[PDB]
Amino acid sequence: ATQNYGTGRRKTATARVFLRPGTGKISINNRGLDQFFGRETARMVVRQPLELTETVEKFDIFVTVVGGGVSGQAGAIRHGITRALIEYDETLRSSLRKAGYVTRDAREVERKKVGLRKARKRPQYS
Template identity: 60%
Template structure:
């Protein structure tokens, strides 16, 4: 069976999360790991974050989004899906690139968890200090 419609892939990353996103021309349906957006990300702020590239480019009802995301927590996963959607949108329509670049959706967020240092309890938290 041959694919009748065009599909566009994009890989997004954030913290430890990696998302493989597939865009298909459709009605605006967003499915992440086989579950609807509202069910996978129950927090409204994360739902808005995932939809930001589609809203910025005014393509919210024009594509169906199917994403597989692994690793990290929910915030990192939402950021990874957002990054993947933005990259897939550029593959779908190169004229959207300046809008996505301006919004910062194509830039991989470099902030990572800081490593723990020896002599400290966490990355920067020092053990309790006693003068005497």
């Protein structure tokens, strides 16, 4: 059919993104988009790959995201929807490889090592 499955992970988050033709229906975990992400700039960051590919009005969007942090789930959707947009063709492939959206951000947290206190901070001597 026209249902399109999109996943995306960033900072231990995971978002199921479904994409199908509709009229601006943006719903996440049975919540509105302005209601879910309370008072942040990432309310527009989830639209940034969408408005780049000039399809902001032409699809239903159904998002289910689990785990992660507050602004880590918003990055999971942004990576998640870019994989769902490229199930169509590779016309928007070059519009997103150049945009720097398709690559999953590999930067994950680092473990505490013995002798040190943080991942790299160490106590003071004299």
